[PDB]
Structure 1
Amino acid sequence: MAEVEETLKRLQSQKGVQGIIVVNTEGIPIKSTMDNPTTTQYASLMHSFILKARSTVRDIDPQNDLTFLRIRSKKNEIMVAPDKDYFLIVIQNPTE
């Protein structure tokens, strides 16, 4: 549990940092490196989308499940790994 939170900080990567938002089972981000308005505009928008994967994923068969996800984007990389009782959107990049 505590080690898992430490992993989130490792998501900082190095500097690409497009914005980091940690969200719990509540939907509301328990933490974020964003100013504030970006945090909810993305958190609320991404939160709804992330549940679609687990929902859509389970709809076909319980045999499989969502272990990780990453949407490509011209402006930045989109990736949100849903863990145990917490999940987060990691907006960052390789300065590419």
Structure 2
Amino acid sequence: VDIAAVDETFKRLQSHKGVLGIIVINAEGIAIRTTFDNDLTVQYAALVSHFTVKARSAVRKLDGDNDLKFLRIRSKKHEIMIAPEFERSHEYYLVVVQDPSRE
């Protein structure tokens, strides 16, 4: 069953070095799978939802025929990675948090 495939993708990603977290959030800002506790989850979901719709509106405004498949914000602690796939019937901006300092 493909549920084993997506959970396997979580261990594929999460087996990498330093990867603190993986989470998936849909267009209505509600997380679906987690890896964190519940409140760091909901504050990521709200913040990243608003930020990525602003960034996509920025890129679409800047050029009409160009969209984004990628987003990468930096800390001094952890490099949040956002990926979105803007489509109909699905738009699931998955977001990873990682850093190469650990381990």
Deviation of residue 42 (structure 1)? 1.4
What CA distance in whole angstroms lies between the structure 1 residues aligned with 2:8 and 2:83? 12
Distance 1:30 1:63, change over 3 A: same
1:48 aligns with 2:50: yes
More strand by share: 1
The TM-score, its normalising length taken from structure 1, stands at: 0.81
The TM-score, its normalising length taken from structure 2, stands at: 0.76
Q: What per-residue deviation string (whole Å, max 9, x for no partner) do you get for residues 27-86 of structure 1?
A: 111111001111011111111101111111111222211121111111101110002421
What CA distance in whole angstroms lies between the structure 2 residues aligned with 1:7 and 1:50? 26
Residue identity matched to 2:74: R
Q: Tell whether the 8 Å contact from 2:27 to 2:49 is kept in structure 1 after alignment.
A: no
Distance 1:8 1:93, change over 3 A: farther
Q: Tell whether the 8 Å contact from 2:77 to 2:99 is kept in structure 1 after alignment.
A: no
Residue identity matched to 1:95: S
Kindly name which structure, 1 or 2, has the bigger radius of gyration based on alpha carbons. 2
Match of 2:62 among 35, 45, 60: 60
Match of 1:14 among 4, 13, 16: 16
Match of 2:27 among 18, 21, 25: 25
The count of corresponding residues between Structure 1 and Structure 2 is: 95
Distance 1:70 1:13, change over 3 A: farther
Q: Tell whether the 8 Å contact from 2:14 to 2:21 is kept in structure 1 after alignment.
A: no
Extract unaligned runs of 5+ from structure 1: none
Give the match's secondary structure for 1:49. Answer: helix
